[PDB]
Design a protein around this ligand. Structure first.
Ligand code: BTN
Ligand code: BTN
Lengths: 126, 127
């Protein structure tokens, strides 16, 4: 039901300590739909490309507060030659807003490609 | 022209095992090296799903160093609205005889008041 989300640059911390900041811009073509921009700071132990902002991009559907966004792990600080996409939904029914996602992370190990699966639960950082 | 270059050269059509079609457009990222913003349209043909047979915008990001991509569709247009969204992530495999885009996907949706996220996999080949 959520215009504070749509109007701001809100912040979301996951169970690994990473932080997602989202910005929404109305789609020129799709109703109730928004272009997602912002940045992602990865703090997940055992991963690369930690501690610096990476741009994120995706799409958000305001009808039932569902989102899908992606980061390519390439910036001025570090390049992990990989990308992640998250897809899930927001739940504002509790005293703390939560984002529940599943993610895939495509990467290479030498010449071998792979896609790792996982789940990120974020809570809003008011 | 190498297969990773044909991809960027203009618009390409990629077709998955369900008969769905992804049309990718690339333009250079404003801030990230070796990265492209992904735009285009997705026409769905998957059995047992909604929103079939019309174009939906797609958006995402592409890493050109090893041809890895992640893109999403919100299933809202002038024809149908499925109140859902899908994100695909994967890689372009140019090693075999024909190119395959290999992906995992997640589809977020509601069944009444219960939210869920469905997993699957799509392999896309050139048209
Ligand atoms: O190691 C890499 O290839 C780049 C960084 C990966 C970070 C992953 S993305 C999914 C999961 N959620 C996080 O916040 N961090 C990890
Ligand atoms: O039924 C819906 O909620 C909207 C259409 C979903 C189509 C899914 S997205 C993943 C998979 N790949 C396809 O090409 N079609 C299905």
């Amino acid at each position: 039901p959520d215009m504070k989300l749509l109007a701001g640059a809100s912040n979301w911390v996951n169970q690994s300590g990473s932080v997602a900041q989202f910005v929404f811009t109305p789609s020129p073509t799709q109703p109730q739909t928004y272009e997602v921009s912002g940045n992602y700071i990865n703090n997940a132990q055992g991963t690369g490309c930690k501690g610096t902002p990476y741009p994120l991009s995706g799409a958000y559907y305001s009808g039932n507060q569902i989102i899908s966004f992606s980061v390519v792990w390439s910036n001025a600080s570090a390049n992990c030659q990989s990308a992640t996409g998250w897809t899930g939904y927001f739940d504002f029914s509790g005293s703390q807003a939560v984002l529940k996602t599943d993610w895939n992370l495509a990467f290479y190990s030498g010449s071998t490609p792979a896609i790792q699966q996982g789940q990120d639960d974020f809570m809003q950082s008011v």
